[PDB]
Ligand binder design. Structure first.
Ligand SMILES: Cc1cc(-c2cc(NC(=O)c3ccc(CN4CCN(C)CC4)cc3)[nH]n2)ccc1NC(=O)Nc1cc(C(C)(C)C)on1
Length: 285
């Protein structure tokens, strides 16, 4: 893994707070496996390492805790502690009661709630987290709505970057990947920029699958030939323009996340943008 060597040298197991297993209570499943837990009371999310897994997974599990614990930013999920001295091993994580962003968007579509400014705040939150990660030379490699988490559903919600770790050629999230990534296996901060553009599309489409009527292979051929997605319905031009800049064919021509964050902030200053009505779904279609 491209992050293990650096994290291993510059972060200690002693940095991880071992919580006695007796003080941890699993309350319910949320979605290895992830539970809502309680520490004696702190409310937490608990990721488990299934006992059937291997020694490579042992490393992967420890490294997830070490890597998360390395960061300190409001828009990146917190590691709260660990319980590695008991089986199955736990990682204790910030509980995000809003759930994943993709599910949130699909379930909160306006029906016969959300406003444009709400979407912009989510995008700003994640862009803020990405800028922090870029500034610390960390390449996420799977920026997507499915890996973004929300503190709560209502106003004042905060979005944060996580990684559920779901990512052969059939497992590649090709629809979030720039050409140099899915053709050459090259990952940089500018490949995260591309993915963020696709995340923006997800957000302002209110949770549609990217390239809705296309398979992965069709997208591969589409994108390598210069093809790009059209704007989501009712998407403001300034927002779409950010997407298309994230999707420049050459990474050198894509903005960094400092620029992306600035441009999103500018959108929140434009009444014509934030007063744009989101589309409304008519049941009978
Ligand atoms: C694995 C995981 C889960 C959570 C986690 C998940 C949760 N909530 C839920 O899972 C959940 C699900 C459903 C609902 C219910 N609904 C909400 C409201 N209702 C109305 C609709 C549905 C509520 C909460 N809270 N916390 C956190 C962290 C991680 N791990 C993780 O990030 N690792 C990463 C991170 C990194 C970076 C940052 C360096 C890239 O690298 N490794």
């Amino acid at each position: 893994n491209p992050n293990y060597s650096f994290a291993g040298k510059t972060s200690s197991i002693s940095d991880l707070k071992e919580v006695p297993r007796k003080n941890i209570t699993l309350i319910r499943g949320l979605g290895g496996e992830v539970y809502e837990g309680q520490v004696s009371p702190l409310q937490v999310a608990v990721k488990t390492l299934p006992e059937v897994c291997s020694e490579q997974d042992e490393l992967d599990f420890l490294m997830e805790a070490l890597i998360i614990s390395k960061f300190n930013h409001q828009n990146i999920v917190r590691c709260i502690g660990v319980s590695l001295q008991s089986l199955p091993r736990f990682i204790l994580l910030e509980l995000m009661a809003g759930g994943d962003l993709k599910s949130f968007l699909r379930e909160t579509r306006p029906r016969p709630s959300l406003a444009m400014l709400d979407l912009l705040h989510v995008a700003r939150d994640i862009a803020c987290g990405c800028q922090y990660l870029e500034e610390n030379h960390f390449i996420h490699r799977d920026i997507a709505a499915r890996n973004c988490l929300l503190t709560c559903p209502g106003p004042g919600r905060v979005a944060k970057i996580g990684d559920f770790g779901m990512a052969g050629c059939a497992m590649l999230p090709v629809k979030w990947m720039p050409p140099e990534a899915f053709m050459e296996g090259i990952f940089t901060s500018k490949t995260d920029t591309w993915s963020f553009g696709v995340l923006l599309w997800e957000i302002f489409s209110l949770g549609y699958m990217p390239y809705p009527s296309k398979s992965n292979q069709e997208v591969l051929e589409f994108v390598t030939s210069g093809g790009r997605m059209d704007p989501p319905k009712n998407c403001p031009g300034p927002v779409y323009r950010i997407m298309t800049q994230c999707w420049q064919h050459q990474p050198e021509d894509r903005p960094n996340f400092a620029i992306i964050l600035e441009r999103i902030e500018y959108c929140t200053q434009d009444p014509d943008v934030i007063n744009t009505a989101l589309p409304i779904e008519y049941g009978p279609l």
